[PDB]
């Protein structure tokens, strides 16, 4: 269900990284599969060539943590009005304290040593469930239908 | 613009927000509504310097850069006990344990 | 507005806005039945960071502005994870 539409209508977009993370732009092709694009260092902007109806999502380039674009999960370029590009403001979401804690413990402990931490069993499973573009797309297609 | 603070005295901490243009006196009115002590029985500090009631919080050094929601600035508090003010005493928080072997 | 007191295991009292403390579902339940909540396993170096998270969450949720990172020092990360899991 979630895929770019092959409109062939050009649309200029500014990918503006308003986050402290290195951003990985991800384009969902016409079969719904994610393709990685060049990364954006924190606080940088790039004027890029895209098309109307094309579906984009943005992640942390090192850990694949989910990021927002114009306060939502997916970005679709629209027609350029008055010779102006469309801004795609990539920002950090307000993560839950538990998710932010999992992000920091994952950045310090190797996955083979998660089981060595003196924590409850459910927290080992939470640490192992790393951010995954494939999983979040399934969750988004299910909520798009419903 | 808003400034986010921790008003600290002995073993009590108030997490509150205020405008950068608001005064030290207006911050004492906030403390009055929580700890039930009037502004004349209060002294607010930054590190060790006593703050004058008529200055703005920005004029004291509490700005969007030093007083953030996720990193609030500390404002020391000392109450008046029978016509004399107690010495400013802020008990520090507990020390974290040694960093685990797998995290090192 | 309304305030609540959250006491750490080492005796520190944290006075926070009731709306902010209601970020945690566990705290909401503790205030619904059996304005003070005592945490016998959360120390002050963890509970002070939990209170900083509540104001961070209330300030930046639904805001259309640049969101800063919520910082966590490596020394407190594991205990803060345990507290966040209990508090939801
Ligand atoms: C500098 C930079 N930094 C981060 S990302 C980036 C960037 C670089 C170059 C382009 C140029 N456009 C494309 O490569 C895509 C855009 C897509 O919307 C459609 N598409 C594509 C291709 C093959 C079949 C069908 N469509 C394309 O040509 C974009 C971003
Ligand atoms: Cl560019």
Numbering used by the authors:
A (entry chain A): 62 to 207
B (entry chain C): 1 to 104
C (entry chain B): 16 to 49, 58 to 111
Kindly provide excerpts from the paper associated with this entry.
The Von Hippel-Lindau (VHL) E3 ligase is a component of the CUL2-RBX1-ElongingB-ElonginC-VHL cullin-RING ubiquitin ligase complex, and its natural substrates are hypoxia-inducible factor (HIF) proteins hydroxylated at a conserved proline amino acid by prolyl-hydroxylase domain proteins. It is one of the commonly used E3 ligases for proteolysis targeting chimeras (PROTACs), a recent drug modality which holds promise for future therapeutic strategies. PROTACs are bi-functional in nature, linking a moiety that is specific for a target protein with a moiety that is E3 ligase-specific. Currently, the chemical diversity of known VHL-small molecules is limited.
Based on these encouraging results, the diastereomeric mixture of 1 was co-crystallized in complex with VCB. A crystal structure of the compound bound to VHL was obtained at a resolution of 1.98 Å. The well-resolved electron density allowed the identification of the eutomer. The hydroxy-piperidinone motif of 1 occupies the hydroxyproline recognition site of VHL, forming conserved hydrogen bonds to Ser111 and His115. While the RHS motif is conserved compared to reference molecule 1, ring expansion and amide inversion leads to an altered exit vector towards the LHS. Further optimization of 1 to engage in pi-pi interactions with Trp88 and Phe91 from a pyridine substituent can be envisioned. Interestingly, the eutomer observed in the co-crystal structures exhibits the (R,R) configuration, not matching the stereochemistry of the original player-designed compound with the (R,S) configuration, but does maintain the key pharmacophores. The co-crystal structure in complex with the E3 ligase reveals that the observed binding mode matches the player’s original idea. The identified hydroxy-piperidinone core as a bio-isosteric replacement for the classical hydroxyproline motif provides an interesting starting point for further structural extension. 1 was submitted to protein-observed NMR experiments: Protein labeled selectively, with 13C-methyl groups in the residues Ile, Val, Leu, and Met, was used to obtain a KD = 182 ± 76 µM by fitting the dose-dependent shifts.
